[PDB]
């Protein structure tokens, strides 16, 4: 702590990561493979 070591935060918070895994799930469950290749 006296030593000039630091820990920077990630750009995407765990809240934002959980919103992406939610969108990937909701796309997969409602629309199959289609949201990977065009509109859902």
């Amino acid at each position: 702590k006296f030593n000039g070591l630091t820990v920077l935060p990630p750009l995407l918070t765990d809240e934002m990561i959980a919103q992406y895994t939610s969108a990937l799930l909701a796309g997969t469950i409602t629309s199959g493979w289609t949201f990977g290749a065009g509109a859902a």
């Binding site: 630091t6 920077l8 935060p9 918070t13």
Partner: peptide, 29 residues
């Protein structure tokens, strides 16, 4: 830390949530 030219000057002081009271002003995570 700083941004560029048209995006003029305005700086970040890179604390681990430790306050801005050491230094518009906006405390940030």
């Amino acid at each position: 830390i700083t941004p560029g030219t048209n995006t003029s000057n305005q700086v970040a002081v890179l604390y681990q949530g430790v306050n801005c009271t050491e230094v518009n002003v906006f405390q940030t995570r």
